[PDB]
UniProtKB/Swiss-Prot annotation:
One GO term of the biological process aspect: biomineral tissue development
A Pfam family per the record: Pelovaterin
Entry annotated with the keyword Disulfide bond: yes
Protein name from the UniProt record: Pelovaterin
Species of origin: Pelodiscus sinensis
Keyword DNA repair: no
Function, as annotated: Induces the nucleation and stabilization of vaterite, one of the crystalline polymorphs of calcium carbonate. Exhibits strong antimicrobial activity against Pseudomonas aeruginosa and Proteus vulgaris.
A Gene Ontology cellular-component term: extracellular region
Cystine residue pairs: C8-C38, C16-C32, C24-C39
Domain of life: Eukaryota
Keywords: Antibiotic, Antimicrobial, Biomineralization, Disulfide bond, Extracellular matrix, Secreted
Subcellular location: Secreted, Extracellular space, Extracellular matrix
Lineage: Eukaryota, Metazoa, Chordata, Craniata, Vertebrata
């Protein structure tokens, strides 16, 4: 739903995870490679 100004490995999102294993929808895909996103880890 239009996530905030976050980024992979900038706050709570990990370094980089392959969408192939993704499980969320509102995750974040900024700062990562084309095809890899990140979800709320901690």
């Amino acid at each position: 739903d239009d996530t905030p100004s976050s980024r992979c490995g900038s706050g709570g999102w990990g370094p980089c995870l392959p969408i192939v294993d993704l499980l969320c929808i509102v995750h974040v895909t900024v700062g990562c490679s084309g095809g890899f996103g990140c979800c709320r880890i901690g």
